[PDB]
Design a protein around this ligand. Structure first.
Ligand SMILES: Cc1ncc(COP(=O)(O)O)c(CN[C@@H](CS)C(=O)O)c1O
Ligand SMILES: Cc1ncc(COP(=O)(O)O)c(CN[C@@H](CS)C(=O)O)c1O
Lengths: 405, 405
């Protein structure tokens, strides 16, 4: 894996910001796209754009073939059994909302429990809040260890025989934690529940295997894995998706429509109302081709190299708190003593370094850490150790400057 | 309005299909994009792609500015009062589903009536079916005149004092009918109801004025107005959108998130959960710039010219049934005597002519016409009278061939 060759594929990286070279370290918010994906979108809009499953002319069949081939690329990418288990959505948030509306709100009686965690993104929290409010069920949280990890014993103690849904993220966007999804799925099934994996932060950086994890649902976003914005994937076990009513209604997802009642299509189109995100899904397929061409194991090893390097360099700075475990994904969430994270992000952007500051759409975790805000630098397959050097040097300069104030 | 200059902007038009030049006549399914829109997507992914409202670095603010400027372009394009009334959705289907889930299912008691029409797209039918099923309300239909138009007297007789929602399309994707949306809104308000306009087929071809129409909701799709796929707009009156609960939950749309309850953001972000369709919405803004540069009145006049020409040329063929009124939009829905529409579409694609065959996601209308299937040729701002000549000549050749069989 030559990283110069990879960086040469992303045109947005080769620019300057406020005089300095661009050091993009906000991939956990969104990733950049290689020429393959952008040129896939270009070829679609330039050559064979047409509506899919709706008119059998040449361009129509070309577009339909591209769309469904992207669906099968997704099926192979995450090792799903059937592409009937692969549903194209607007993103991870929309997929989680779909599971919460079509599975949760239809399979929860009072006394049933929905268990999430303290590190969950807001997308994996509020849908469950609203579902248990609509059904009168109970929302429970799995506590976290002092290093930000989850122990399986805490899981077993939190999920009971009255639990219907375990909702948990694969990788934490704040802590960098890689949660034990496999054993958690075993635990949830032993108690008669299903498991919903928020895989928004894991899918771009590590290989996914729905079979090995035995997850009942899995949600991912394309803009974080070098794919176009506005498209994501919901994976559900075919047996579960068959008994779930559609979250949306309209064309493409119906079989027969009478004046008052209608019947639905087979999977997966039962859950894809209206004209789908054609170009977006085909570009996501291009992104999957690109990632598999580089190799997801290689990307994971590069990420772990960057993360260990960043943790060591951060420990070389004093006056910096880093949140989360040692074994982690490629992101570092931190704060500087006596400097607010927004000012850190501002002065880092003055140096052309792009980081995120705030709660990262995880306020319960922020209060769990007893912090109000937080800075974060996230790495992907185009980031170098030289960029982490620039980051830690600018952090030392920020500390020296604010101390001199 | 020079149409050669316009056709030069769409690269997909200059290709051949099965030996013949491409004659794209399926714009009612999806439209083609000019270089402005594709190059807007290219510039976004090449220069300033970043997550919006989430990290204040330079690329982040550039992307946020582009996204919100596209929102304001949409507000100007349809004359909305405030961009708090402009919500970016996945498409017309998703916007109609949002109105049906967040307004209908929360403001319908048994005895309330929801009135639609016989010509409505499936997207403007099944959401109301499911809403009245969830609430126990009543679904009613406004009958159609023998020429496929709606009379205001039939409206007044159908909508009563127990009606909460009139749901009607602005332009019919099958009939070409332009419904009297303004007077229908007056009628609905006189009976204490709101009005939901399915403007999927009107927005690309004619000027929209939410103020003049006084519609309570308006749904549009971007892929039909030269914009990217996967993005559309829901317009709701600010006073109505303020009292509607969000259809989706997650990041970006919340203010405070506790363990069990959360509070929402202001409009419009209250209805935009998760990472939004950034590139898609910015490309839709580019499409709006392009359309306003040509002029929507000019596009409407070109459409009426093409439609009158096509109606006359079709009447020059015998053995052809055309469905709908004389005054119409730029689409012709038809059938040939003793030839099935799928075969018509196949032999037209052999000549490189792209038409749609089937029910066009409007089965109730198909049975209302006492037909099972149907062919359709739709025109947009890049279609010429020479292409309609090719269409009618290929139709005559198809008639001669199938008669010789
Ligand atoms: C673990 C996890 N789960 C869900 C989401 C949200 O998915 P969407 O693609 O935005 O719909 C995110 C992304 N949250 C972004 C932007 S709020 C971040 O900067 O971390 C996530 O990290
Ligand atoms: C009046 C009207 N209302 C809603 C829709 C569907 O909107 P979407 O953008 O697909 O979500 C359509 C488009 N129906 C397409 C493809 S099914 C046609 O070929 O006619 C429509 O014409």
């Amino acid at each position: 894996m030559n990283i110069t060759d990879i960086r040469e594929q992303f045109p947005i990286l080769h620019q300057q910001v406020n005089g300095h070279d661009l050091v993009y370290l906000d991939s956990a918010a969104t990733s950049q796209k290689p020429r393959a994906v952008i040129e896939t979108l270009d070829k679609y809009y330039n050559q064979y754009n047409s509506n899919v499953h709706r008119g059998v002319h040449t361009l129509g069949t070309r577009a339909t073939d591209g769309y469904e081939g992207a669906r099968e690329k997704v099926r192979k990418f995450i090792n799903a059994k059937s592409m009937a288990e692969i549903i194209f959505t607007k993103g991870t948030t929309t997929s989680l909302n779909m599971v919460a509306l079509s599975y949760a709100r239809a399979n929860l009686k009072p006394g049933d429990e929905v268990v999430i965690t303290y590190m969950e993104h807001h997308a994996n929290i509020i849908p469950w809040q609203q579902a248990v409010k609509a059904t009168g069920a109970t929302l429970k949280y799995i506590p976290l260890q002092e290093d930000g990890t989850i122990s399986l014993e805490d899981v077993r103690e939190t999920v009971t025989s009255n639990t219907k849904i375990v909702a948990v993220s694969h990788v934490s966007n704040v802590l960098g934690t890689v949660n034990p999804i496999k054993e958690m799925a075993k635990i949830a099934h032993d108690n008669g529940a299903v498991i919903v994996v928020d895989g928004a932060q894991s899918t771009p950086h590590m290989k996914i295997d729905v079979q090995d994890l035995d997850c009942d649902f899995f949600a991912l976003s394309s803009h974080k894995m070098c794919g176009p914005t506005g498209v994501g994937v919901l994976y559900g076990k075919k047996a579960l998706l068959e008994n779930m009513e559609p979250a949306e209604f309209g064309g493409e997802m119906i079989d027969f429509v009478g004046l008052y009642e209608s019947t639905w299509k087979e999977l997966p189109w039962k859950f894809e109302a209206g004209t789908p995100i054609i170009a977006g899904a085909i570009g996501l397929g291009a992104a999957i081709d690109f990632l598999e061409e580089i190799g997801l194991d290689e990307i994971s090893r590069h990420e772990h190299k960057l993360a260990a390097y960043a943790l060591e360099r951060f420990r070389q700075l004093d006056g910096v708190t880093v949140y989360g475990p040692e074994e982690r994904a490629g992101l570092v969430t931190f704060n500087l003593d006596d400097v607010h994270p927004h000012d850190v992000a501002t002065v880092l952007d003055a140096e052309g370094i792009a980081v995120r500051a705030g709660h990262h759409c995880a306020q319960p975790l922020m209060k769990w850490l007893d912090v109000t805000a937080t800075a974060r630098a996230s790495f992907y397959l185009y980031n170098t150790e030289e960029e982490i050097d620039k980051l830690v040097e600018a952090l030392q300069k920020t500390k020296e400057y604010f101390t001199n104030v």
